[PDB]
Write a protein that binds this ligand. Structure first.
Ligand code: OGA
Ligand code: MN
Lengths: 19, 205
């Protein structure tokens, strides 16, 4: 596992998609 | 390149088998340039703030595509969305039912970048990363700013140049740890993340 917990902020809202 | 056939014919098999997919010359010279002009137009505004974590040396701004004067960016997002939904069910086992706003990010140069990380380590719902590169005639040898991905199970490296009019797809989870090596030139990119329905439900829990 070469991951890290320094993830880019997913942001503020989520947009509905496809259904 | 037929829009919806490109998906089933290239992006789907590429993503399932190898985990990464690159689509060069996604829209064309004039389209890409209109995007770049709209982006730098946003860049003069000064509404860019420092990038945020869930280290990173970029300044960004979120765009929903419904803003006047960002018509072309919206066109891009509509294309990506049409592709995704058209793929739905075929990409791994994912059933994508959402996405983020678009992240318009700029690296100032000066060697700043993004240290090795993972876009979704904790399972927040993001299952695919899309990045549109619009940096024209980018000479990596002198300009750095390369996106280095370390695929799990593969021994090789994945080095992506931020070429103009380049589209990048890859799994957002731990399968693709990536980093943005120091950038010594202005490096612009537009991102958007796609959410899996079930995992998205898990994050609330
Ligand atoms: O822009 C790139 O090539 C890579 N960017 C990121 O990994 C990010 O914004 O989280
Ligand atoms: Mn990232």
């Amino acid at each position: 596992d070469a991951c890290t917990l320094l993830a880019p902020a997913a942001g503020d809202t989520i947009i509905s998609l496809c259904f | 390149l037929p829009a919806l056939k490109l998906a089933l014919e290239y992006i789907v098999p590429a993503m399932n088998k190898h985990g990464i997919c690159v689509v060069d010359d996604f829209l064309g010279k004039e389209t890409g340039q209109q995007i770049g002009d709209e982006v730098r137009a946003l860049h003069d505004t000064g509404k860019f703030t420092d990038g945020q974590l869930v280290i990173r040396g970029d300044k960004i701004t979120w765009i929903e595509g419904k803003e006047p004067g960002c018509e072309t960016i919206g066109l891009l997002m509509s294309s990506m969305d049409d592709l995704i939904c058209h793929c739905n069910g075929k990409l791994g086992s994912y059933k994508i039912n959402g996405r983020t706003k678009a992240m318009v990010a700029c690296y100032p140069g000066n060697g700043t970048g993004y240290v090795r990380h993972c876009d979704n380590p904790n399972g927040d719902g993001r299952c695919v990363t899309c990045i549109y590169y619009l940096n024209k005639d980018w000479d990596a040898k002198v300009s750095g700013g390369i996106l280095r991905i370390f695929p799990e199970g593969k021994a090789q490296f994945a080095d992506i140049e931020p070429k103009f009019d380049r589209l990048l797809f890859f799994w957002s989870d731990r399968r693709n740890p990536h980093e943005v090596q120091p950038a010594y030139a202005t490096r612009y990119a537009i991102t958007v993340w796609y959410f899996d329905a079930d995992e998205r439900a898990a994050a609330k829990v």
